[PDB]
């Protein structure tokens, strides 16, 4: 005679992870994983907070009216990949321009160099151009982490920007690197806006798509070193309302001026 | 000679879950599980908080009078189902209009489509109409989560709203979906009111019914993705006093102007 | 040669539970368990907090005088019974009028009823009167928790207050129930005062009696549903000083104007 | 070659409990355990807090002077005995007047009494006097905890202050009790001062004596009922400076106006 | 090819305890363990906190200047010895005058004494002088912790300051004790300054010496009794800058006006 | 048919420790581990915090503009080495001038010295000069930690600055030490600026270099003694913007006025 209360009426349950794609403003619906995804993303969460203003009357304060004063959307997660794209994303810059699967050249030194010189001889200058950054790799000795900028390439001789402080022997390598600057000088205000898309699925493989026309990344670069577990970057984003001059305004007003709309 | 203190005088103990039904304003007593229930609901709690104002006299502050200044009712729980009805409920919209047991069409593509086209050929356009939303499902490749709106259906040819950015091969599927907008443009204030009903039972299968003529959903949509446990939505509701223009005012004044009344 | 410090001088130790009785104002000494007890009560605690005002002199602040500014008594516990008496107690109403061992009638339907009718035929209308509340119990199907008020009883035909929204078959039952309203309309202020008594015993079966002439219940109804453990109601009471118009003022001034006095 | 730092220079270590004695003002040095001790006392702690006022100069704030503005002494512990003496101590009253090893009379009823009578017949009225309080003990039935005051004793007939609400059969007992009132009407302010003494010993059985000429009990009566562990009362005391009119002022000024002095 | 980062460059690691010495002002460099050490000291910690004031310009608040506004040094630890020296140290008094290895006399009573007398006969008055304090030790009976001051010694008869309240039998002992007063009447302000020294060693037995010319003890006497673990006293000290009139000013200005200097 | 979401797109994961190098202002790119490293460093973390100022319009507060008001960089870690270089670094002084692998002389006494003398005879005065500091090491007896300054060396006789307070026997040693003063008298403000560099690697041995042209050490010396685990020093640094007069300003403006730039 026992009766069960609060039982299920369907099968739409969610146990999975989600993919976060960030791209240029105006192309929220046309984001692809290869070109716009972040990478290994864990614990993606979406939060909504609403605030109301109430008018009350009487001793017992009976509400006669209630007015919404603001709703806020927040996106957070953890990223487990340190490449130029993810670092640029974490710094609030356009990270989709870079690539996570790029190669690193590794040239080989064929002639020893002493302290005080600014020229080096390599096996072949293929993949290295003027203005590139290289990090010296020494087979024996401590790693001082010395980076040099290539100024001129003539034949097999590379001229570095500044004189050497440690000797380079035969067999050492010059590993190509990318320079990332934490300050963007072309942004007057320092705030840059993007578009976002979130993709997931149900237990029955029913897709879930969440589209945010405008987002702002309010977090910063966080790198913690340790031997216990893998380092990760904490992400935080907020959704904003579009204006007349903003790209994608037509999509914004077509969907009832919604910051976020779902396709379930 | 040992004596027992604080012993039981009856058998009315409660160890069970409860069913929460939300419906239109004015029909609090006629809610049915199939049409108005939320679904899998866990940890339903009802809370009452009362505030008093006291007048005191003397050095020791002896109370001469005490006046109630307000009582508040709050309903909370966890929902484990992600369908249009529950999402609409969580967003503060009329979720009883939708259905949790609806079907998804899944059409089959019979002709390959390249990048830059906006027309596709399917096996049969049964269940798909103009203005519907479809999510492309690719058997091979990454899932970019691309959604399209059907603009015109002629014979077996479907014209999508915008040009393709990824190719569609033979055997791909178009999964029907529903569009949910987080902003309701027909609400001047943004606050919408409903009726609620809670059903449970004792250990001896004695029913318990709680009826709330007016409620307001003060929470928001909360979706958290992870591989540890199933995702759920946290709900929060508050009871309010009815006015002359509100539907169900006759029931409100008949029961002594009570926000909540019980039938145990 | 070892010496023991802080040793016991008697045998008055307390390891037991206590019984809490709440009754009408003025009869604090004549409360009986059957008519005034709450039921299964756990973790009963009595707390006293005193505040003093000190006058200080000198740089080191030597106290010259100290004046008491107020003492407060608080009673709390957990109740594990959900019946009309305990719910009325938790709501701040006179719960001793109801009974925890009352019966529920359960009538049997002998004729099917369709949707849209407001009359039903039962086996026998014994125990059911005009104005009673009944909850429909269906053997098969979901439990929508539908409650009806009896308007008129003629022969074996019962006329309900409103039309049916779900069909009733043969074999269904009408379970009698009691209506509890959370708002008392006959109280101008909303604060109602009672008397209390606490009974316990020592390890040597020596009775302990605590008598509080006036109490106010400052808590509210708290119901939490779950499958982990039994639901309980948290109680909170405060002791107050009696006035000239209050019943039992003679007992108050006879015992030195004490809010609480003990008989150990 | 390893060297040990922070080694011991003596054997004065303390692992034991302490005895707390509270008595009348002026007799701090002549307190005895039988007449002034509290009983089973656990976790006795003494705390000192000092406050200073500093005068600083310069950008780096170099202190030129420092003046003490007050020192405070606090005594706390847990008591595991519920008798009139300990309850009076916890309420801030002179508890040394009562005794913890007193007896309880227990008279036997030799004639049944019905509801509505105010006279009872006992075996022998030895140990019971006019004005005493008795708690009725019933062999069979629930324990309502009924207390009566004896008004007149003639032969074997005892006249109670108020009419009976429950019947008394043959074999029931009248247990003598003591009435404790939480409010002292003979204290104008509500603050009463006492003397204290603390006795302990070292590991080598070297006595430790702490003498506090004046203390004030700032805590209140705390009784918590439960089946997990034994109930206890939390104590808190503060030391104060004596004045000219206070008893024991000669001892105060003889020891340099010290609130607490030790004999180790 | 794996490379290790953040590797050690020497062997100066510290796993040991430290010795804390407190002595008179002006002799910070000449403190010896026997005469100035505290005793069993555990968990010695040294803390430095610095505060800066910054001047900022622009919207992004670029610092143009930063000025130190104060540095603070704090010394803390736990002491596990209760003797006159450590108690005097904890009370903020000159504890180096006392000795931790002093003896306690223990005289033997050779004649019974009744209640009301103030004279006692002992075996031999060796080690006891006029003005000493003695604690009576009774072989049988409760320990009331009674302390008496010797007023006059004639032959084998000792005259106590006040009359007896408990009888003394044959075989009882009079244990000599020391009187400690918590208030120093010869200090106008209540703040007394000392010198400190800390001694430790590395893993390779390389000594570490820390010298603090002036310290102030800001803690108080803390005694907690219990049967779980040994009682200890928490210490706290702060370093201060010396003035012209302070002893050791020459050492202060010779080392660049440093509050603390190290010899590692 | 199961699909995986949030998958990895590369192999740039980080599980390793990092090396922190601190050197003179202006040479951020030319720091070497032997001369500028701290030593055993654990749990190195880099944190970025950004603040924005928003202009809002309407009841719902739609942001029209957002302006950055400041970004902050913080570097923290734990150091497990106590030598002059690390102590000077922790005190905010130029620690790269000292060396962590220096030797300690240890001279041998060949003639006993009594209390009150200020001259001592050693085996050979090699490695000891005028003005050096020596700590006396006694083979037998307690360690008082006595330090002396050498005033004059003639033949094998060493004259100490002050008279002896403890005797020195034959076989005792004089261990050379270094004096560190916590206050720098040549700094007008007390704030000194340095350059920093951080070196690490990926799982595939791809170097990571972080360069901070200007840092300020805002922490202080923290030494905690105990027998449980090894003592360590907590470090904290903050990055600042360079000015015209600061060294390395050319590097600052060349990289877009960035406080921190990365080479990954």
Coordinates of N, CA and C in Angstrom, one line a residue, chain A residues 80 82 223-232, chain E residues 2-5, chain F residues 11-18 200-205 208:
Chain A
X80 N 43.1 22.9 -18.5 CA 44.3 22.2 -18.2 C 45.3 22.2 -19.4
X82 N 48.3 24.8 -21.3 CA 49.1 26.1 -21.3 C 49.7 26.2 -22.7
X223 N 48.7 30.7 -12.5 CA 49.6 29.6 -12.7 C 50.2 29.2 -11.3
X224 N 50.0 28.0 -10.9 CA 50.5 27.4 -9.7 C 51.3 26.2 -9.9
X225 N 52.5 26.2 -9.4 CA 53.5 25.1 -9.7 C 53.5 24.2 -8.5
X226 N 53.5 22.9 -8.7 CA 53.6 21.9 -7.6 C 53.7 20.5 -8.2
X227 N 54.2 19.6 -7.3 CA 54.4 18.2 -7.7 C 53.2 17.3 -7.3
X228 N 52.1 17.9 -6.8 CA 51.0 17.0 -6.3 C 50.0 16.7 -7.5
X229 N 49.6 17.7 -8.2 CA 48.6 17.5 -9.2 C 48.9 18.5 -10.4
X230 N 48.2 18.3 -11.5 CA 48.4 19.1 -12.7 C 47.8 20.5 -12.4
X231 N 48.6 21.5 -13.0 CA 48.2 22.9 -12.9 C 47.0 23.2 -13.8
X232 N 46.1 24.1 -13.4 CA 45.0 24.5 -14.2 C 44.7 26.0 -14.1
Chain E
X2 N 64.4 14.6 -18.6 CA 63.6 15.4 -17.6 C 64.6 16.3 -16.8
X3 N 64.1 17.5 -16.5 CA 65.0 18.5 -15.8 C 64.3 18.9 -14.5
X4 N 65.1 19.1 -13.5 CA 64.6 19.4 -12.1 C 64.7 20.9 -11.9
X5 N 63.6 21.5 -11.4 CA 63.6 23.0 -11.2 C 63.4 23.3 -9.7
Chain F
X11 N 49.0 19.0 -26.2 CA 49.7 18.3 -25.1 C 50.4 19.2 -24.1
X12 N 50.1 20.5 -24.1 CA 50.8 21.4 -23.2 C 50.2 21.4 -21.8
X13 N 50.6 20.4 -21.0 CA 50.1 20.3 -19.6 C 51.3 20.6 -18.7
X14 N 51.1 21.1 -17.5 CA 52.3 21.5 -16.6 C 52.2 20.7 -15.3
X15 N 53.2 19.8 -15.0 CA 53.3 19.2 -13.7 C 54.8 19.2 -13.3
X16 N 55.2 20.3 -12.6 CA 56.6 20.5 -12.3 C 56.7 21.6 -11.3
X17 N 57.9 21.9 -10.8 CA 58.2 23.0 -10.0 C 58.9 24.1 -10.8
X18 N 59.1 25.3 -10.2 CA 59.7 26.4 -10.9 C 60.8 27.0 -10.1
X200 N 60.5 27.3 -15.9 CA 59.9 26.0 -15.7 C 59.8 25.3 -17.1
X201 N 59.1 24.2 -17.1 CA 59.0 23.4 -18.4 C 57.7 22.7 -18.4
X202 N 57.3 22.3 -19.6 CA 56.0 21.5 -19.8 C 56.3 20.0 -19.5
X203 N 55.3 19.1 -19.8 CA 55.5 17.7 -19.7 C 56.5 17.2 -20.8
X204 N 56.4 17.9 -22.0 CA 57.3 17.5 -23.1 C 58.6 18.3 -23.1
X205 N 59.0 18.8 -22.0 CA 60.3 19.5 -21.8 C 60.3 20.7 -22.7
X208 N 59.4 27.3 -20.1 CA 58.6 28.4 -19.8 C 59.4 29.4 -19.1

